[PDB]
Design an enzyme around this catalytic site. Structure first.
Site, PDB file in Angstrom:
ATOM      1  N   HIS A  62       0.816  -1.214   0.000  1.00 31.46           N
ATOM      2  CA  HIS A  62       0.000   0.000   0.000  1.00 31.46           C
ATOM      3  C   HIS A  62       0.846   1.258   0.000  1.00 31.46           C
ATOM      4  O   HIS A  62       0.492   2.248  -0.642  1.00 31.46           O
ATOM      5  CB  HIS A  62      -0.936   0.020   1.218  1.00 31.46           C
ATOM      6  CG  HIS A  62      -1.144   1.386   1.818  1.00 31.46           C
ATOM      7  ND1 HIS A  62      -0.966   1.644   3.163  1.00 31.46           N
ATOM      8  CD2 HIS A  62      -1.533   2.561   1.261  1.00 31.46           C
ATOM      9  CE1 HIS A  62      -1.236   2.916   3.408  1.00 31.46           C
ATOM     10  NE2 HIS A  62      -1.582   3.494   2.271  1.00 31.46           N
ATOM     11  N   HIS A  92       3.586   6.262   7.475  1.00 25.24           N
ATOM     12  CA  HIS A  92       3.582   5.882   6.064  1.00 25.24           C
ATOM     13  C   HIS A  92       3.450   7.103   5.160  1.00 25.24           C
ATOM     14  O   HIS A  92       2.907   8.132   5.547  1.00 25.24           O
ATOM     15  CB  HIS A  92       2.467   4.876   5.750  1.00 25.24           C
ATOM     16  CG  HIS A  92       1.107   5.311   6.196  1.00 25.24           C
ATOM     17  ND1 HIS A  92       0.666   5.244   7.497  1.00 25.24           N
ATOM     18  CD2 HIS A  92       0.073   5.815   5.481  1.00 25.24           C
ATOM     19  CE1 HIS A  92      -0.592   5.697   7.527  1.00 25.24           C
ATOM     20  NE2 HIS A  92      -0.993   6.057   6.327  1.00 25.24           N
ATOM     21  N   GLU A 104      -3.395  13.607   0.627  1.00 28.99           N
ATOM     22  CA  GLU A 104      -4.765  13.171   0.818  1.00 28.99           C
ATOM     23  C   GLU A 104      -5.639  14.361   1.219  1.00 28.99           C
ATOM     24  O   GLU A 104      -6.668  14.644   0.596  1.00 28.99           O
ATOM     25  CB  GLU A 104      -4.781  12.081   1.874  1.00 28.99           C
ATOM     26  CG  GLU A 104      -4.036  10.864   1.413  1.00 28.99           C
ATOM     27  CD  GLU A 104      -4.626   9.606   1.955  1.00 28.99           C
ATOM     28  OE1 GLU A 104      -4.789   9.523   3.185  1.00 28.99           O
ATOM     29  OE2 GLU A 104      -4.931   8.703   1.157  1.00 28.99           O
ATOM     30  N   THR A 197      -7.474   4.287   4.448  1.00 21.82           N
ATOM     31  CA  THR A 197      -7.383   3.034   3.705  1.00 21.82           C
ATOM     32  C   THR A 197      -8.264   2.031   4.455  1.00 21.82           C
ATOM     33  O   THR A 197      -8.480   2.159   5.661  1.00 21.82           O
ATOM     34  CB  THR A 197      -5.941   2.471   3.678  1.00 21.82           C
ATOM     35  OG1 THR A 197      -5.484   2.298   5.016  1.00 21.82           O
ATOM     36  CG2 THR A 197      -4.986   3.408   2.966  1.00 21.82           C
TER      37      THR A 197
HETATM   38 CU   LIG Z   1      -2.357   7.506   5.882  1.00 21.57          CU
END
Ligand SMILES: [Cu+2]
Length: 258
Positions: A62, A92, A104, A197
């Site tokens: 991912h 991450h 994001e 996610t």
């Molecule tokens: Cu994240």
């Protein structure tokens, strides 16, 4: 097959497996700087990353990941909108395929080259596992990344990226300091959200830093060379692994700054 970011398994499909993908507090969201409002009750943000705790660095299919030792309170988050102590467990990076996208969360519709996430869990729940099961179990610090000057704390990482190029790979890394990833200012916006996610659990208190950090294009480019795929498989570059802004519904985004 496994959820992902492609056309056939991307974000817009997730809802079939995780109905919460259309919940009332999903992340990320777009921050309207003139809708969000200063909150005098927010206490000062405490980012005590004194004792380093980095253990592994890995590719889980991912994104680029870093795992920390969360046995003690050596790297915690306190203050701000948080009630209690939150332990750093992992970090991450969400990367874009082009310098104009990747982050994001967005600010007034602006996307950054990437967005780093530092995940912490409420030490009042015993462990990470029981935390995500709670509305106030997580605290994720989001940090924006723009292209420009090289970031020192990232070089050492970028130097061994080829050691985790494909999914399932990992390399020891006790060298990671989450302090070298922070910008100068700790002003931020906070709102109740979720994981970005699957399972997309709505268990997150988001703290997005207003001031982005800089990374050179060399560093970025090296991050764009990781693979979603495992060894001996058609190459699928690990880029654009970000979820678009979600409906804010009527949640309130608060500013830590006047
Ligand atoms: Cu994240």
């Amino acid at each position: 097959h496994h959820w992902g970011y492609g056309k056939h398994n991307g974000p817009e499909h997730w809802h079939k497996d995780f109905p919460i993908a259309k919940g009332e507090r999903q992340s990320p969201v777009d921050i309207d700087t003139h809708t969000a409002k200063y909150d005098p009750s927010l206490k000062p943000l405490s980012v005590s990353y004194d004792q380093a705790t980095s253990l592994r660095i890995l590719n889980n299919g991912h994104a680029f990941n870093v795992e920390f030792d969360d046995s003690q309170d050596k790297a915690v988050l306190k203050g701000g909108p948080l009630d209690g102590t939150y332990r750093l467990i992992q970090s991450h990076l969400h990367m874009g395929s082009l310098d104009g996208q990747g982050s994001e969360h967005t600010v007034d519709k602006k996307k950054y080259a990437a967005e780093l996430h530092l995940v912490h869990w409420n030490t009042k729940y015993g462990d990470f596992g029981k935390a995500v099961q709670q509305p106030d179990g997580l605290a994720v610090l989001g940090i924006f990344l723009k292209v420009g000057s090289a970031k020192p704390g990232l070089q050492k990482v970028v130097d061994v990226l080829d050691s985790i190029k494909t999914k399932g790979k990992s390399a020891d890394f006790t060298n990671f300091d989450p302090r070298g990833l922070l910008p100068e200012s700790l002003d931020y916006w906070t709102y109740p959200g979720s994981l970005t996610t699957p399972p997309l659990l709505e268990c997150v208190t988001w703290i997005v830093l207003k001031e982005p950090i800089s990374v050179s294009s060399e560093q970025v480019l090296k991050f764009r060379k990781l693979n979603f795929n495992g060894e001996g498989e058609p190459e699928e570059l690990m880029v654009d692994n970000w979820r678009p802004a979600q409906p804010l519904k009527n949640r309130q985004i608060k500013a830590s700054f006047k």
